[model samples]
Target: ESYLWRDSEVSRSGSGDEPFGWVPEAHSVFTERILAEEPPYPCYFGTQGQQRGNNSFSAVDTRYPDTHGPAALARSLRAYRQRAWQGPKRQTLIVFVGPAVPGAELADDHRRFWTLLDELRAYDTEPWPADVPADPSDPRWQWCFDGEPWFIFAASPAYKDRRSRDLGPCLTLVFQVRRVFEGIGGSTVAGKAAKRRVREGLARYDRIGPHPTLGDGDTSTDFKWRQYTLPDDDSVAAPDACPV
Candidate 1:
């Protein structure tokens, strides 16, 4: 299943002129396109919030301009965390897909992303004892533990829209495992630290490649080239290209 959050509510006004109101069902059109074209990747609609007017769809005169907002994104993330925490054990991954807009500070965006993750981890649930231990050697460290939920961030330089440094076309995907490898331990804090390790593992994904729209150097490929390794010390890998 997939979840999504947008910046504004669906405007029902029949005024086909205002880009701010509902013009033609743009959200539905995009959703249908994604569903029919992009499979194996389920999508769900989440809450609606506001985004700074720099988004690619910001100027588009449509009902749903900028569907991905910070507040709504946070809500979807929380729901995802709750689902992972409450459901049966399985490995989970969360990937963030978006265009690397020029002048757009990645670190700042990451901070917001991290904050949401931290909040989800802190969410109160049944006080279940952690099966995993803090020390890696401890076998108990393989079980469920209370702490931060682990995740990864991926980006594509091809979507890097330098013209609108604030608004660019990008997609975010999140992958999660109900139960990760045990040898790595399962504390939330450790999980967060592990995320960093995973980021380091995928260091090769720090470069850009050829793309149709954004030229070579003009694109933001540094964030997409990095590969994130699992706690099991698996080999390195590369990030995927931008979603057109």
Candidate 2:
């Protein structure tokens, strides 16, 4: 619970042996870079409650060129559903595990994170993430998309121990992406596309390397991950070179 929303790990040339937080883990490091360079895109990612000491996560996006003013910024986000853009706008999900400590200091946290995730992935049916029913009256299915808060794109799993300084010893996983819209909103075609996106995300995911399901106690952290590609997608082209 200590790990609340915080800064991005910027420096790669690591003196790993030194203290973990020796360098500045400031939020400014991330926003400052984005504010300076001004990349041209936006991204949003989040996961359920999984604790990692005091280390939380933070995100950033390039300047939202309010060319046509704030209203246009709002409109640009408002119009992604034109069937025309939907097909090309496939996104993806990336899951990361932290670098390992010498004596496996962070192993407990890592175990807890994947355990919760595996439980979330289990259900009587494939494609349908949670085991809950879909009847609006059942109340349990109230939060489901095809029947869950978020969805996926890949069908097979791939994973390896931390190999990069930026992406520590923690195990990392990447599944494909879909814009992920509200269950009720969006057009029929758009909605169907969203469902399909969710369907594929879980189609090939099995973390413990196969016990059919995580319920089997024998299968512990011998992790496997699913990989999929998110097609080129983004907010509609920047509002014309505004009043320049």
Candidate 3:
């Protein structure tokens, strides 16, 4: 079966007969947050994605700790590469791995995120793009696949303090192509305005204020990878540097 599915398709199939029946429920909960007018989903672009149907979903293996099947995940990445940026606006690819086992900690999900990134690297068919630095410590570095730079967002059921990172019983990874930020990139005026709104929404949605690590990527001195999977509590330390 194809790993990649459109937003409409995922939203439409909630019947018991659906292969991954949990996916529709997961997708619905995710979309509800994105579409909510109260506090909003924080990221304006994310809301845009849901409204315009420019999101692609993949329901991967149900394996815990090792949530992604290498072959399946690789195929999904390839499928995303082929389907992305073909719409009127850029699309976000959200890969879902789920039904968190009891007693799993947020740290475990963090480990899984890195493991998935490594899998992408292992299956990447394209050489690293020249514009991106090889060292993850570089502020310009981003997780690249198929020669394209991607801004990754990781969410988990384990998130309590940072509700913005919570997306139901699943561990989710959302990939946004760098090109999507062309006009509203962090350095631009529009980007700053959009970020301010998102931070405000974050303050309203999460138990605490915006995380320190969640800063403007264009001018910030911090490494981009550090912002991917933030700690459940902002006070604690994030994982030590990039694993890839």
Index of the highest-TM-score prediction? 3
Q: Which residue ranges in model 1 land beyond 4 Å of their true spot?
A: 1-102, 124-129, 132-151, 154-173, 178-244
In candidate 2, which residue ranges exceed 4 Å CA deviation?
6-95, 100-169, 172-180, 183-187, 193-244
Who is ahead in TM-score, 2 or 3?
3
lDDT on C-alpha atoms for all candidate structures: 0.31, 0.27, 0.75
Sorted on TM-score, highest at the top, how do the candidates line up? 3, 1, 2
Q: Estimate each model's TM-score.
A: 0.30, 0.24, 0.86
Q: What does candidate 1's lDDT look like per residue over 170-241, in tens digits?
A: 323334433433433434565445545443422422222212221122222232212211111222333232
Against the true structure, candidate 3 has what lDDT?
A: 0.75
lDDT of 3 by residue, 89-203 (tens): 5688887776555677888888888887876687777898998887776767778888887778889888997887887778899887766777887789988888888888888
Better of 1 and 3 by lDDT: 3
Residue 134, model 3, lDDT: 73
Order of models, best lDDT first: 3, 1, 2
Tell me the lDDT of model 1 at 140: 26
